[PDB]
Paper text:
Recombinant BtuJ1, expressed without its first 26-residue lipidation signal sequence, was crystallised in complex with cyanocobalamin. The crystals belong to space group C21 and contain two BtuJ1/cyanocobalamin complexes in the asymmetric unit. The structure was refined to 1.6 Å resolution with good stereochemistry, achieving Rwork and Rfree values of 0.191 and 0.216, respectively (data collection and refinement statistics are summarised in Supplementary Table S1). The two complexes in the asymmetric unit are structurally similar, with an RMSD of 0.095 Å across 199 equivalenced Cα atoms. Four loops (AB, BC, DE, HI) are directly involved in binding to cobalamin. An interesting distinction is observed in BtuJ1, where Trp 78 is involved in interactions with the dimethylbenzimidazole group of cobalamin. In BtuJ2, this tryptophan is replaced by a pair of tyrosine residues, resulting in a modification of the interaction with the cobalamin side chain (d), which was sandwiched between the dimethylbenzimidazole group and Trp 78 in BtuJ1. For example, displacement of cyanocobalamin from BtuJ1 by BtuJ2 yielded a Koff of 0.032 s-1, corresponding to a Kd of 0.16 nM. The major binding motif (MNTPSY in B. thetaiotaomicron) includes the highly conserved Tyr245, a hallmark across the IPR027828 protein family; also known as Domain of Unknown Function, DUF4465.
In the human gut commensal Bacteroides thetaiotaomicron, cobamide uptake is mediated by multiple operons encoding outer membrane proteins, transporters and uncharacterised lipoproteins, some of which are incorporated into bacterial extracellular vesicles (BEVs). The previously uncharacterised BtuJ1 and BtuJ2 proteins share 23% amino acid sequence identity and belong to the IPR027828 protein family. BtuJ1 and BtuJ2 share a core jellyroll β-barrel structure, where the polypeptide chain forms eight β-strands organised into two four-stranded antiparallel β-sheets. In BtuJ1 and BtuJ2, the core structure is augmented by three additional antiparallel β-strands at the N-terminal end of the jellyroll and an α-helix located between strands D and E in the traditional jellyroll nomenclature (BIDG and CHEF).
Numbering used by the authors:
A (entry chain B): 26 to 256
B (entry chain A): 27 to 256
Write the structure that this text describes.
C-alpha cells in the first residue's frame, strides 16, 4: 500500500579519483556526438554530448572536488562532493546539447525530484565575475542588487506522445529585493508538478544576455539523488 | 474508420511565383529558426532563414521555374505541385535540419508524401550546372562511369528522441547501367516509421569534397504529406 522511493545512484561507477564518465559510442550531430547514459538500475536515461572541448553537454557523472578553478575545464560542483556520496551529475543544457532525463518505466514509476547545486564554473562567474575565459570576459560582471540579477533552472515535463505537462523553476542565484543568494549547498528541487513526465528537459535563463538574447552566464548545473516513486 | 488526412498549403500564397517568408524566427548562429504549422494544425515544419533568404528546413512555394540554375530558384523540376500549385521545398543539413512534427501522434500515424527534385538539383545532376558561375562546386554531371546516386533518408523518432528507423528514396541513380534522375512526383512511403512523433531528413551522394561533405545541393521537394487515423 505504502509507495516505495527509488534513488538513482552512480556511486562506485568511476574507477579513478577526480574523474568523469567518458565514451566514444556517440552518433555525430552538427557539433557534438550524442549518447544516452542508462543508470546502473536501468530506471532512467540521461542525454550525453561530447566534442572538441571534451564534455559538450547533456549530463555526465563525476567525483571531482575542485571548488577553486574557474572556467569550463572544471566540471566540479561548488559543494566539492555529492549529496549522497562521491559521485554526482554535471550538466550543460542549451540548444546544441539539450539535457534530457527519460523515465524507462513510466507506467510503474513517477518522478519525485532531485538535489541541485551550482557548478564551480557558475559559482565563480556569479560571485567573482570570473568565468575563466581569460583576457576576454563573456559575462557582464558579478551579479548585483543594482541589476536585480538572477539565474533560473527550468524543468519541463512531457508525456510519451510529446504533450507538454508543465514547467517548474529553481533559482540558482537571486539578487532581487536586496537578497544576495548564490546556491552553494545541495538543495531539494521538487518535481511533483511534473511527476507523470515520460521525459524532462532542462533550460537555463538569467539577467546577463547578449544582444541576440543568448545567456552569457554558463548554462551549467549539478544534480544528485534523482528520486522516483512507485505509482 | 481508417481515414487519411492530406496536408495542404493550397491557396496559402496571395501572389504567383512566391514563397512563404517570416520575420518571426529566433536567432541561432547563422540562421533564424521558426516552426510552420499547416492550416489544419496537424503538422509542424522546421523553417530557417538568413543572409541568402531561405536557409533550410521547409518553405511552401508555387514557383514554376524549370530553367534557372542555382540556389536563388526554389522551384520543383515539375514546375507545379502534385495536388495543385503549392508544394514544399526543403534544404536539409546540419545547420538547418528539415523536421516534420506530428502534432497529434496519439490520434494519427504517418503514411507518406510525394517527392521530387528541385530545379537546382536537377540541372546540377543532368547538366553539371549548379549556377555557382565561374566557380563550380560539383564534380560534373552524374554518370554510369562513377556509379553516381543521390539519396534522401527519412529518420523516424519517438517524442523522447529514440530512433525508430530510417527509409531511403533515390532522387538519382546511375548504378548498374540505370540513368534515373527524378523529374516527376513519386510516392515516398513512410509505413516503416508510421509511429514517429517526428521525422528528420538527411541527404547523401557520390559527389563529396575532400572532407566528405556533399557537393550535390542538399535540397528536395515534397507534396501531399499524408497522415492516417490509428
Ligand atoms: C555558437 C556558440 C556559442 N557559445 Co559556446 C556554447 N554553447 N559554442 C558555440 C559554438 C561555436 C561555433 C558554431 N558552430 O557556431 C560551439 C557549439 C562550437 C561552442 C562551443 C563552446 N561553447 C562553450 C561554452 C561553455 C559557452 N559558449 C557560449 C560562449 C556560447 C554563445 C552564447 C553567448 N552568450 O555568447 C554562443 C551560443 C554564441 C556565440 C556567438 O556566435 N557570438 C557572436 C559572435 C559574433 O562573437 P564571437 O566573439 O566571434 O563568437 C565566438 C565565441 O563565442 C566562440 N566560442 C563559443 N563558445 C565559446 C566558449 C568559450 C569558453 C570561448 C573562449 C569561446 C567560445 O565561438 C564564436 C565564433 O568563433 C556560452 C556563453 C554559452 C552559455 N553557456 O551561456 C559559454 C561560455 C560561458 C562563459 N561565460 O564562460 C563550450 C565550453 C561548450 C562545451 N563544448 O562544453 C565550448 C567551448 C569552445 C571553446 N572555444 O573553448
Ligand atoms: C560551411 C558552409 C558550407 N556550405 Co553553404 C551551406 N549549407 N554555407 C556554409 C556556411 C559558410 C560559413 C562561412 N565560413 O562563410 C554558411 C552556412 C554561411 C553557408 C551558406 C550557404 N550555403 C548554401 C548552399 C546551398 C551550399 N553550401 C555548400 C557550399 C556548403 C559546404 C559543403 C561543400 N560540400 O562544400 C559547407 C558545409 C562547407 C564549406 C567549407 O568550409 N569548405 C570549403 C572550403 C575549404 O573552401 P572555400 O571555397 O573557402 O569555402 C567557402 C564556400 O564553401 C562558401 N560558401 C558556402 N556555401 C556556399 C554556397 C555558394 C552558392 C557559394 C558561391 C559559396 C558558399 O563559404 C566558405 C567560406 O567562405 C553546399 C555544397 C552544401 C550542399 N550540399 O547543399 C551548397 C552549394 C550547392 C551547389 N553545388 O551549388 C546556401 C545557399 C544555403 C542557404 N542559406 O540556403 C548559402 C549560400 C552562401 C553564399 N555565399 O551564397
Amino acid at each position: 500500500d505504502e509507495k516505495m522511493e527509488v534513488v538513482i545512484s552512480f556511486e562506485n561507477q568511476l574507477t579513478e579519483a577526480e574523474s568523469e564518465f567518458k565514451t566514444d559510442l556517440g552518433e555525430k550531430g552538427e557539433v557534438y556526438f550524442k549518447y544516452e547514459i542508462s543508470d546502473p538500475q536501468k530506471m532512467i536515461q540521461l542525454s550525453h554530448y561530447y566534442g572538441d572541448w571534451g564534455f559538450g553537454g547533456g549530463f555526465t557523472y563525476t567525483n571531482k572536488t575542485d571548488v577553486k578553478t574557474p572556467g569550463y575545464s572544471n566540471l566540479s560542483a561548488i559543494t566539492g562532493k555529492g549529496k549522497n556520496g562521491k559521485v554526482y551529475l554535471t550538466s550543460n543544457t542549451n540548444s546544441f546539447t539539450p539535457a534530457q532525463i527519460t523515465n524507462l518505466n513510466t507506467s510503474k514509476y513517477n518522478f519525485k525530484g532531485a538535489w541541485v547545486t551550482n557548478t564551480t564554473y557558475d559559482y565563480l562567474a556569479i560571485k567573482d565575475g570570473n568565468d575563466g575565459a581569460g583576457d576576454y570576459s563573456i559575462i557582464k560582471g558579478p551579479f548585483s542588487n543594482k541589476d536585480n540579477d538572477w539565474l533560473k533552472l527550468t524543468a519541463t515535463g512531457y508525456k510519451a506522445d510529446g504533450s507538454k505537462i508543465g514547467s517548474i523553476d529553481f533559482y540558482l542565484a537571486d539578487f532581487r529585493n536586496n537578497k544576495q543568494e548564490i546556491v552553494n549547498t545541495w538543495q531539494w528541487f521538487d518535481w511533483s508538478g511534473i511527476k507523470e513526465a515520460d521525459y524532462i528537459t532542462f533550460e537555463m535563463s538569467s539577467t546577463d544576455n547578449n544582444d541576440n538574447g543568448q545567456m552569457n552566464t554558463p548554462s551549467y548545473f549539478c544534480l544528485d539523488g534523482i528520486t522516483l516513486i512507485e505509482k
